[PDB]
Design a protein around this ligand. Structure first.
Ligand SMILES: OC[C@H]1O[C@@H](O)[C@H](O)[C@@H](O)[C@@H]1O
Ligand SMILES: OC[C@H]1O[C@@H](O)[C@H](O)[C@@H](O)[C@@H]1O
Lengths: 449, 451
């Protein structure tokens, strides 16, 4: 078997602003929802915050050198809205925007394609105080913010993501409250999901007016497999699938919301103006897939609101975040996504990776992470399998370039292919990163044998 | 001591309720969704899954309840208006059917000889405004003033005593700091901002009342006095933090004293400085002030008890109500003296809520409800009011919380504060022994308490 990838297939690594940057008040940056959330007791594992993180705002030069050592062809990163427009709407902060301006120039100088994400979960607190994703005006606030970046980086950043993972934003931030802004309401979740979709479409429209390049959304899909042949379990599987995988994809594709959501959300479900769905389905140029695992849901009448719960798949390895390792499901998901998007929408895996225990410091200058290595090589082979089945896949970004703050789980969950000692800020390339650099250099051939 | 309890001329006796706790009919006649409609229909938030969807069915049954007021000899009825009934989206269109309910209620009260005492806000923000940030959005002061105007004009000459905000501390401490009440946020950052905007909204409503209203307007504060747990300095510092956060946070800015210095210690990095013009707005002169009072606390140091780092020491020497609150009537006298001092002695006060929760059976027994501890609480706390008047406090009335057993917010129907029992299975009302005594207190203007 040859694992050589297609001509032009793009290899990179990914991060997010709050998870790596630190410097939360630097250069006139505004407060974000995560600045508040992480400083509230009880919310974060071990009381961890992103105040320092990987100190990447100050260490970006060294990190670009690391990218070159890994042979990266692209770097996927998010822009902190609060840095650029501290009050969310109104005055631009030139100092905060300058950080991204120098970063982007550094990447281009290194021969690395900059892939920017507008929103990776760090709403400015000033907009949260005005209702955040619950305020329908956020579509316009978000389009205006996007315009700042589309214009500033015109001709430099050519591949743009609007929203990273609408499901986590809404399920975590509004439905269950495990993530900022920490609300727990089905009523709110329904509305916030709708405004996230509208903001995406408004940003795409603004991009057509002023931008240059290709724009799209980034979704996470967690494929749902049958727990049994019982009808009540199939219904549970459908509910879980509708709420997690189809909630955003169907309206993006012009199919309206899944019918199952009226069952899942009950009296919290709402209907919206027709014109909203035209906005939401504004044509995009590509779509990103964030992918990590599958689930096997069974009926669970007390598991609000989907009334489903995953059955632990004890036959397989599980990561430190408790996610099953099952590479065939990545191939299956790419195939499904290709079917659902009509097969003519270019796809990229914009995040894939795995968390395993690593010590807090390098040992003899190394970090040996054989299960992360195994996950990496088996999932990249699964990608190649998907390409062989007609999926128009154009790139792969490893989550993550660096160990970082895994949101409410804190620094306890390491996804980096490069280790960060959070005490010293020393970076150490892990064995997974060493392998990945060779996958890129050989364009996959290293996996043959 | 030979003690007598006749009250001053014109001292006003009544009972109090709040819209969400009694009305039911949450979607009737064009009413808009409120934050409590959402909160109560979210699993885990309410004891037993109780909601206000029906409550005491007062939206339908209000005429019966007015007859009950008459049997109690009430001179006044303190009630709240549901914002989202009157202005379903919080701003914009006024709902005439929703406003008509309060219109008929006010006329019914006047015809019965009962003074209507209306509260603009008793915790039921329209959900359309919560979706725009609710008390975190500075524009809420203006939205609230516009809502006030609708009522000030509609009831001009009929409702003459007005309350703006019922208990800022409960709204913010419960709704934004700890999340136990709607809208269920848990953030010191948000609590600091919400408290400031609740104050600004009060000030804006008073300014609007000066322009379009007729009568007397004021805010209603809850105070829970904090007493020393020990002689340890760490416990006195804890007492000061608890007292600043609960009792002075709102009162000091209302009186032009700024925020308590202790709040920088309690809220730390969540604390914010605000523009001077805001404090001008907050301190807009009022005509009267309401005190909601139930109990005291004896705080000790508790480093893990966020954010005040204090916790109450159980006072096992005294009775406690079903809500776990100590029964200690001298602290009512003490608080009224303190509040009089801390308002300069020139602001008329009324006790706008006072009362107690005790177990009652779910149905009347031979047409009665015998509630001797609620009777005890009532008569000893009314005496304590009289003691405060004797110390020079300008107290002008007393409203019993509550006219009716009702939905005790997130504690549900399990905590009964009524002087009238409600059988929630049948909607039958039965005046309790506490209500029967109260009726005689009013009739005798206190004299019954002598014997
Ligand atoms: O949970 C692991 C990762 O999941 C991804 O979808 C998110 O975009 C990352 O921010 C996150 O760290
Ligand atoms: O908790 C007992 C009572 O406290 C009062 O201060 C509130 O205004 C009522 O709504 C509540 O039922």
């Amino acid at each position: 078997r040859s694992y050589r990838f297609p001509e032009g297939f793009l290899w990179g690594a990914a991060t997010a602003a709050y998870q790596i940057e630190g410097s939360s008040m630097a250069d006139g940056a505004g407060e974000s929802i995560w600045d508040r959330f992480s400083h509230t007791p009880g919310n974060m594992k071990d009381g961890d915050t992103g105040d320092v993180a990987c100190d990447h705002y100050n260490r970006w030069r060294e990190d670009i050198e690391l990218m070159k050592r890994l042979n990266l062809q692209a770097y996927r990163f998010s822009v902190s809205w609060s840095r650029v427009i501290p009050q969310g709407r109104g005055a631009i902060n030139p100092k905060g925007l300058a950080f991204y301006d120098r970063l982007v120039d550094g990447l281009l100088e290194a021969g690395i394609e900059p892939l920017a994400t507008l929103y990776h979960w760090d709403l400015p607190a000033a907009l949260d105080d005005r209702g955040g994703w619950l305020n329908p005006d956020i579509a316009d606030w978000f389009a205006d913010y996007g315009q700042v970046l589309f214009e500033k980086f015109k001709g430099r950043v050519k591949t743009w993501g609007t929203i990273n993972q609408p499901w986590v934003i809404v399920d975590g931030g509004y439905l269950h409250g495990a993530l900022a802004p920490g609300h727990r309401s089905a009523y709110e979740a329904v509305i916030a999901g709708h405004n996230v979709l509208r903001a995406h479409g408004a940003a795409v429209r603004r991009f057509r007016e002023v931008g240059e390049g290709q724009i799209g959304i980034v979704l996470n899909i967690e494929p749902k497999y049958p727990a049994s042949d019982k009808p009540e379990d199939e219904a549970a599987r459908r509910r879980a699938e509708a709420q997690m995988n189809r909630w955003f994809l169907d309206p993006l594709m012009g199919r309206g919301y899944p019918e199952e959501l009226t069952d899942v959300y009950g009296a919290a479900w709402r209907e919206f103006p027709k014109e909203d769905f035209e906005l939401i389905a504004e044509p995009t140029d590509w779509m990103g897939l964030n992918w990590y695992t599958r689930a096997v849901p069974e009926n669970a009448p007390d598991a609000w609101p989907t009334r489903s719960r995953p059955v632990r798949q004890t036959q397989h390895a599980h990561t430190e975040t408790g996610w099953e390792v099952y590479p065939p499901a990545l191939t299956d998901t790419l195939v499904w996504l290709s079917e659902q998007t009509g097969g003519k929408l270019p796809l990229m895996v914009t995040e894939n990776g795995s968390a395993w225990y690593d010590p807090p410091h390098a040992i003899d200058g190394r970090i040996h992470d054989p299960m992360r290595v195994h996950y990496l090589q088996t999932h990249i082979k699964a990608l190649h399998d998907a390409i062989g089945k007609g999926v128009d896949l154009r790139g792969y970004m490893a989550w993550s370039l660096l160990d970082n703050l895994e949101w409410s789980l804190g620094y306890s969950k390491r996804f980096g292919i490069v280790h960060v000692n959070f005490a010293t800020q020393e970076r150490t390339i892990k064995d997974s990163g060493l392998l990945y650099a060779e996958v890129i250099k050989t364009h996959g051939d290293v996996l043959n044998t």
